[PDB]
Symmetry: D2
């Protein structure tokens, strides 16, 4: 059983929902859904905590307490690994090396920035010759509403909660209904670490007519930060508009990888394998479109096919497992529906295209095969809409400007990876991709000080580094006439 | 007054009247852009990004922007006249605040465009060869600009200057009530050699007009707006499906606070200005005033005196201090607050009506500078934004009390504090829940500072680097070595 | 006994010298003086250490190790308190709440800054229209020679060593002969924490024709950072000139305090008492000149007399001890010589002027009385020369511009404290004072992110925050034509 | 015809010295050498101008006035060209497109940074719980002493004078005896722009026992910034040592170009031709050492020989002129003394090696030939000592780690140019070169915002961008207790 955490107490709710293990379809736990009344209690508790001990902590004391939260996750490391794996079916090795360490690192990085961050001093002259001073300060924005996704549950959850707390805000967070275990554990770490009641609040539930909608509509929040589907971003923006709430969105992507004729071909095959199928292609940053220079296109597709078919699709702790299932049955229905749509649009299915057959309990889970399509036009729905499964379409190109234009011809703009060994090409091309993040000869390498976010439908605002310290703060200007 | 689109001055199939509010006389007809014309503006701005404007170095861009500035300086007095006519502002203030600030907007952001740089982050990797992350600023794209009538050219250019400085193209809809200086600006840009499609001026209104069409148009990348909060919320919903970047500077109900240890004459002068400047039609004006009990009556009587000394009349009159409100429709809204004040229990210390001229001005849109006392913190006249030359004055006793009373608001743009005490100034300033605090002064602006509000008073910050960030895509480029 | 620490090993020397407890003149330990050959050994080992594991550490791992050093000092907190107190006589109170906590915070602040710090990206246009990028990086400068003072032994020692290590340098450091203990213990902490051999080297000795000089002359160093007497600063600057070594100097001052008529009078009396007599007036930052507006002058002098006479002078762990002895008998000779000079120049001795009579072992120590002078002119030697003991002279003033000129009419310019409750005056007056550091209504309040340094004879350069990160690094610009 | 400019007046002197045209050895003008007394008068007047209307300008007005200076140079553009060409023999085209535009840009860039630069606000907590603010401000350092070189007279002179004035200092500036004309014209432009008297002072003369040394010894300056030979940098550091004056040094170098096998070969030949022979190899950034991968070595050398022999050495207005003379006969004697040393050391002379025969007035000037050597060892003097003439030695190399070691095996480290088309190599190699400036696939591309300086004997400190705004300012911390 997974309880809510409100004003320093773990509390049940009236109704509950099932958390299902996508590996086998079995029940992991029951999760009490916070109702509107409990959400209001969380918000009000969070407002009030801003006037309690939390509000009086020095930036050094606040940061030391956040490092302690992080020590707590570390001390329960394997429990956190086990929770993420149960909920989502992610390979244990990924949970051990990507997800939980990044969740620890999020807290440490922003606790550090809390200590080092400063503001600005501007001098000016005036008519009377005595001058003025303008200095700025950072204050907590207020209560931050976090609605976070199921694909990187603890990582993306802490990505928001860490800078929010580092900036002195209080929090009411709603983790995905598909993945609530690690967040529920984080609350326990919060509690045991002595985080004052009301600072961090955890409400479980869904979106519409549930905890997520209640949060989004509550007038006592000062901001809503959200990662997830683009149409949901749009819904959230409409919902907080009457309140003119500060908003921060990381949304969909139809991300491209580009492979030039001078790429290290083996490294690019391996890189596109990772960018297409990591977390079974359920990363916002995954490459679902791939452009490859004509002269190496056949060799690239053949190489990637071989490598994709070597992927081990199986149990999270199975020997050399690469790929787990999708998050849920309902998500798999959506993915398989694009699988059929691609055949109908005229794709050649280079590999995959269906669901593997296990002849064991995994057949009741939510697996699909890693899939490569070829032969679709740039207009096809499967080349333009985010699928959020382990798939990519590969298309040839001849000319640099042509491929830049094809990558950019999109209502999204989150990320792009480019493969080339040429110094000029790397820099010339990357600056021309209309996205928030480019990688050259790698993918999803993250320095947490960098600005991160997207253009067009992929989001608005930036987080990371000082961008987060600014978003989760009131920036106030104080002008002294001397 | 014509629209300016893709390098050409063009008419529309419908015009509206621009009325001089000093005397009710028609100044000019203004062609209203239709949906088809707004689309034409946006499409041309989009195309302008791939033309000569797009290929200018940052140094040549800034030079051209400095040339726009020079262009305005060269026609300074036509600009003063245009702004006066539209709005009735004192000729002196147009001449030393409005027009100079608009020129400084262009110059400051041109200068920032040349000095701004971005970031390099080094990192280690597993294989031990490392990686580099660097950031770049790029044009965001087409900037939709919808701007207010109270400081027409100043607030128009406050947005347009950073948009252009960051290499964007612009589709700008100035207020229906003050379309003249913008139209001149378009002439300056045309004569200065700004490439076609880079700057586009479209005239009209909000709902079912140019403004609405702009905000609904999918070709823009951002919408920056200064105005009413409710209009802000409307825009946010309209751009939500395209998840457009937004920047809002919205209403306030701003307070001025006078502590017992203030320089009382300076404070009286200060609040006089903060209350009645531009006939109280700055979003930054003080419509609430808290004065320490020990000095409350002396402050009110002094403010009464100085307020009654203000000269209300012609923009060019000898010692004029105030002009009219922007329009009859706005005077109607303001006179309706004047009545609501009485009906709410207010003591009228001064004004509370219109003045009498017995000449054309009676056809104008004047109201008197007004002071109220005796209302409660929950009176509507003390909570809601009026945007006229009026303030209510209320006593206070304690520091924590007045802080709480200032912050007890759904708005939070600005606040002025009067005190001679060092500790008090810094202690109290930091606790006011607004974007902008002034101590011992008001509306003193350094264009590098973050400017914006909290709560209903806005979203985001503009000014200095905050503008340079808002009006650009920040992109991260990560090179594995 | 106290050894040098060279290339991973404690070692003795030919010569040794005594370390004397200034409370009672008794021997604490023998200290081995490093010779030229062993200084050469230290520099060469530091050079090679740059090419060993130390140099392969990530910024993250380097920072973690520097936090381990800080941990290792926290774990021996009281031993470090004991060692500082023994060498110098400072009250145990001050060692526990200022000295040792700073040494520790020095390492932690600079380790944090190493993790958060980044550099710059400048794009530019070029003729051919393809453009160029300039990006800068921070690299280790090389071997940093550190020569440090006895007045704040571990605090000022670590103030240099911490940023030097945080920036990836290696270090050869010479603590003061008068206070070698806390540094030798620090060497132990480094050894125990696994600091690779050669990264940190400790050499004992004196200046001329001893370790200090040898260090400054050695061609193998990249920089010389020094805190102390101005003339010594000049001497070091000449000695490194042939090698054009980077230099950073925090030198002396004759710091003033200004009390304006609208000051909080009791607060100003307390603050000037603290800025004149803290550490027995042996801080670079103490106020030896004081200017008080005429209207409150007599009342200020009377009040300070009373408070200075309530000061407890005695043992480091005595009840509410306020002052210990001076660092040494030799230093007391110099200070008393000044006490006589002040009388000779026609000063009224308001209080003090001598040494107290203990009638116990403290009579064998190096104590003097807190002293206050009036009636000297601005040109008197005792008003213009740094005495570095617990004394201040007080003079009246009438005008603001007048007292600004009087404070500024000095060949030094480290620090100044001003007392006033007036908003305008604090900002108007502070910006006109020709020094590196001004305090308003307080003194020696340190934020370790701020630039610290002086003007004129009081120094060269700035340290603290980014200024330390720039000083202890090569800043390199890399320009890529695209 | 060349007078000093002191406290607002052009004044002559007791002695005069001749300014000779290096194209033909003919007298251009006589220059009045400043004596110790005039040097004192210049400093004293600079100190007073700080207290005058100059000191009171807002930053906006001071910047407005620096732009006027720029405008005034621009209105007399061709006279500045004539003056530069006359003193130095520089090709008119280069004077007209590099030297004078850069001189004007220096002023515009720093006037602009004066208006945009701001400082820092640090908040901090305190024991009593009400906290404190620290903020910084930039103020004029004071009187800046400028001593500038003959190789880029107006460019390097204004590179120091622009930021000095932009930060509100006053200046006493001693231009090179070899090239005093353009600085004297600047003085006229200053006068005519209405720069208040004493703000800018021009003194002419030599170094030791002349205006150079006297400026350097005056206690009245706050800083001395100098570009030129390293030994003269050392001498300077010693002379201001008793003063602890701020110092900023851009000294010599023995800069390398490195060409890897994957370079665009024709681009690298053109690039090394420029880096070797521009301004007749009298730029401190010139490459006198070149390392070329053995596989392209013969082809590179053979290609560079051809391009070198296509260089037109002659008159500044000669139809296709590429190179003018060296700066003086005195300089030519040194360079020819190296051309012989090279032969005596065993060099093969690929081309040049002597002086060309014009059979006209040019034979009385100071020309040498563009020269290329091979065959020397890395320890040869001609490969290790700065010649400062139009020459380079070319050596082959095999390994990347090897060429990096050979490049870095130098007491200097000013700049390096690398040629490669490989992305990783470019970034991997550049960061390992121990210099202040690396160019990749170009040379002497300058963005004035970037830090500019050297390591080891090549310099001290950084200039450019905020590094200039920081060096030419007092940085002051003001700490307000609340
Ligand atoms: Na913010
Ligand atoms: Na942006
Ligand atoms: Na400085």
């Amino acid at each position: 059983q997974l309880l809510n955490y409100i004003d320093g107490n773990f509390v049940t709710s009236a109704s509950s929902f099932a958390n299902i293990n996508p590996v086998n379809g079995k029940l992991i736990s029951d999760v009490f859904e916070a109702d509107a009344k409990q959400v209001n209690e969380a918000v009000v508790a969070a407002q009030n905590a801003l006037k309690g001990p939390w509000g009086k902590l020095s930036v050094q004391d606040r940061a030391a307490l956040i490092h302690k939260i992080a020590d707590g996750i570390q001390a329960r490391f394997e429990e956190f690994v086990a929770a993420e794996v149960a909920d989502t079916g992610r390979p244990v090795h990924q949970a051990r090396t990507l997800d939980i360490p990044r969740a620890i690192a999020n807290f440490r990085t922003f606790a550090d920035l809390a200590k080092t961050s400063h503001t600005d001093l501007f001098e000016m002259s005036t008519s009377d010759g005595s001058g003025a001073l303008n200095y700025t300060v950072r204050k907590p924005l207020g209560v931050i509403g976090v609605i976070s996704p199921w694909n990187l549950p603890l990582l993306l959850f802490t990505w928001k909660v860490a800078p929010a707390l580092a900036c002195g805000n209080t929090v009411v967070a709603k983790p995905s209904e598909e993945s609530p275990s690690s967040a529920t554990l984080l609350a326990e770490v919060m509690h045991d670490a002595g985080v004052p009641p009301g600072v961090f609040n955890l409400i479980h539930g869904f979106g519409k007519d549930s905890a997520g909608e209640f949060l989004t509509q509550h007038p006592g929040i000062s901001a809503l930060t959200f990662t997830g589907e683009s149409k949901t971003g749009s819904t959230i923006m409409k919902a907080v508009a009457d309140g003119v709430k500060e908003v921060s969105f990381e949304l969909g992507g139809k991300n491209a990888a580009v492979v030039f004729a001078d790429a290290d071909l083996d490294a690019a095959i391996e890189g596109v394998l990772r960018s297409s199928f990591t977390n079974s292609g359920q990363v916002c940053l995954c490459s679902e479109r791939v452009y490859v220079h004509r002269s190496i296109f056949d060799e690239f597709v053949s190489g990637l096919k071989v490598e994709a078919e070597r992927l081990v699709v199986g149990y999270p702790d199975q020997d050399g497992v690469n790929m787990g299932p999708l998050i849920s049955h309902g998500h798999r229905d959506k993915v398989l529906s694009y699988y059929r749509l691609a055949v109908d649009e005229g794709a050649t299915v280079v590999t995959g295209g269906g669901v593997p057959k296990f002849n064991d309990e995994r057949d009741q889970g939510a697996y699909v095969q890693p899939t490569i399509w070829t032969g679709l036009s740039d207009k096809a729905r499967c080349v333009t809409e985010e699928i959020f499964g382990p798939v990519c379409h590969i298309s040839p190109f001849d000319d640099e400007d042509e491929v830049i234009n094809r990558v950019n011809d999109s209502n999204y703009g989150l990320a792009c990876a480019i493969w080339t060994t040429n110094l000029s090409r790397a820099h010339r091309v990357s600056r021309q991709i209309h996205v928030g993040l480019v990688w050259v000869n790698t993918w999803y390498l993250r320095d947490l000080r960098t600005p991160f976010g997207g253009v067009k439908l992929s989001g608005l605002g930036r987080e990371g580094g000082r961008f987060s310290m600014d978003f989760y703060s009131d920036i106030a200007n104080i002008c002294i006439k001397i």
